[PDB]
Amino acid sequence: LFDENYYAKAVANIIGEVKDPIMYKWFSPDQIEDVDLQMGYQKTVKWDAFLNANPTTIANEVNTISTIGFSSEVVRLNYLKLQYKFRHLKQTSEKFYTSDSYIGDINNNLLPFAQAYKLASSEIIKLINHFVLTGTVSIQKDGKNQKRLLPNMYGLLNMPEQIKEEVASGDKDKMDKIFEKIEAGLSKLELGDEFSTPMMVIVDPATSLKLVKPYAAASSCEKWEDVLIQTIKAINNREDVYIETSNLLKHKILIYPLNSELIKFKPSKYMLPTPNEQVDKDSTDVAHSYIDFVLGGLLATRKTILQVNIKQS
Amino acid sequence: TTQLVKEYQEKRSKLEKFMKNPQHDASLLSNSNEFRDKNVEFFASGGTRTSKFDKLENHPFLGYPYKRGVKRVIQHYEPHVEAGGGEDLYGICIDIDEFSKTATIVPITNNFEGYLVAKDSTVKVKDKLIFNKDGALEKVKATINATALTDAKQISNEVYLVKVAVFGNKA
Amino acid sequence: TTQLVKEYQEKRSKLEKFMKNPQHDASLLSNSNEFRDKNVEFFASGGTRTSKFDKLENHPFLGYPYKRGVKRVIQHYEPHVEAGGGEDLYGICIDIDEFSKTATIVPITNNFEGYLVAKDSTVKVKDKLIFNKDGALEKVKATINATALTDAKQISNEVYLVKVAVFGNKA
Amino acid sequence: LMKNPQQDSGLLSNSIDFRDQNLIFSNSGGVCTSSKDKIENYPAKGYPYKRGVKLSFGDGTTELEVEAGGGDDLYGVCSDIDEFSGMATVIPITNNFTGYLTLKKDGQNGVNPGDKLNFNQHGELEKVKSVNAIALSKAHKLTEDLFIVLASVFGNRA
Amino acid sequence: ASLLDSNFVPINFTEFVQAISNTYKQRRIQFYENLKR
């Protein structure tokens, strides 16, 4: 194959240069499990037992015993497949555009296949990370003109049946009001018996800067960040708490546990960018190529994610 | 088209209301780690206490007699069981299978303890209950002796499950 | 119960009537050994004659524009194709993936030959046809040039398929 | 007035964000491109880049050329220019096109998605008769006199 | 069956694609091994 398909050989050499996604930091190693498909749906069944009555004493002779029931729930996860096309130079045509310092046509914005693929892969990965955190696909900084997606395709920010808190516009700078809502949201969380788990916090940089201020007269030797860490530790049974900063978020705080039993990420094994065998070729030096990637595979339990939105109006 | 989809969802919900274990696809996992009050559901088949020497009979049924008192109806096909009470009561349906349309029923000669459908929420503990014409338990001329162990618990708009022990017929 | 089941059947039939390939399980196989007149079906996607160099565009759709003329409607989400005609005609829908809810459209700049939905059974061969507001073809303000090749064929109460060739716009 | 800016830049580019990084005049071609599209090239008169073109005939010694224009003489849409050879890449009016095109600097605020567009005498799109063009976005200003817009052209109308 | 192995030689596009997914998985495993919070 590598003796026949130059483009396949080029991708194999250049695949190591693509950087790992930042979404890996948002999840524990145990929370991510690969599945095997490209487009469609999968079903997961969770079995739970229950006690139907008080236990019975084993005294003398008896044959009437209490019963233990069972029940199951099934959750359907929708996947999707998307593709992008990019132009580049034909392999035989590179030698006629090689220069002492670079290869390519500067005037017409044409690259060798290896360079174009690496840049195109990086752009796709950024869009992948945006969807995982936000649940939406868009290329506008305004966030409008979103691509309509399938049902049962949610991200962390748009997962339904989760706790959402809104900070009023007038209190957007009042850190005390912000912490008031967070505590109320932390109260409404329902972790069941899995509360003894590490937690993860994601904040936009603007909120991150507000946190590093000294904790409020005023005090010292303590920051708003540490106050948040203690408050979260009150509900996770004094477990570890991690904080991360993502430029993708805007005036929003995300809190969710790091237990696979509550939130699990099950993406396709072909989610990351993958080259396509179809390569358009003409009489000129311009060729076209396609890259494929798969979206979907986030599963979470009801009322286990806290979403604080700071209204900047 | 969308209106047809909405009407289809409405009728599907209405049909699934009268079902033992309706199959639904949900986007999230419901969490019920608390082990208390996890047994009062419409899919809890059988009884709270079950003996190895209990007599179970499977019969073809008409309608939905699940968790209701049943009576034999003769019509050509074999006789079936229909949800009903009064003096015609033959047994109580404790399990159902919709694929084969077969109801598993305990005869009236065998005592039972379990959750059954009640007419309304006016039933308290230590109350004498009678099976009505629809096979539902209503507060009290009782041919059988059924006493409520708990109070009526509501799950759906009309679903009322009450824990009752039935131990034969009166005189 | 029984009334609910009947309503479920009626709603399912009405919904699946407006479907390209509704999934209906049958108790027995059908006989179609004769090789003639097997192409007049609602699931016969694509066109009668298709060129390798045809242009196909996939867009999200609202409603059911299958085998109908489509227009572009811009809303926040991306613009979507909606069943409509008149002076707003952008193309014709030739296929739909219901899982992704994505419709495939051949632009009006390209010529097509295939079966399309007609307004009624009043269309004869060698007739000039116009796309109505609903994306259905009606007998003749013909901004486009479409000619019927066969007569209107009936599959259902409102399903009328007619073989038409569309080859651009008039002047 | 050029595919690539004539003046150099004193700054490196920041390749961090991925949103709204395509509203540049150097963006050639169409946003969604079909592999079955018919692509022509012609000698270029003037700078018809990102503009509707029409056929231009000289005395006869030299072959015909393409110049920015519209109205009753619209032949296609120019989507690329090679400056070294002066070859203008033109997509015929009979072929569907979707991309960013020059917009008239008059009432550009009034242009909204879903608005009917027609070419003017200078190959610039304007809000409306004979050409089927629909705006898919709002006017993006790249220069005090240069406005581009996302529009789709799908042939002539009656 | 990963692109990291130089000895590995795919025979067709399908093996090439499977190697890519294996290569991505190994990198994800390697990242979590070397991740410290």
Coordinates of C-alpha atoms in Angstrom, one line a residue, chain B residues 1 121 132 139 158:
Chain B
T1 CA -46.3 15.9 9.6
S121 CA -56.8 7.2 47.2
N132 CA -65.2 -3.7 42.2
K139 CA -63.0 0.6 50.5
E158 CA -54.9 7.1 37.7

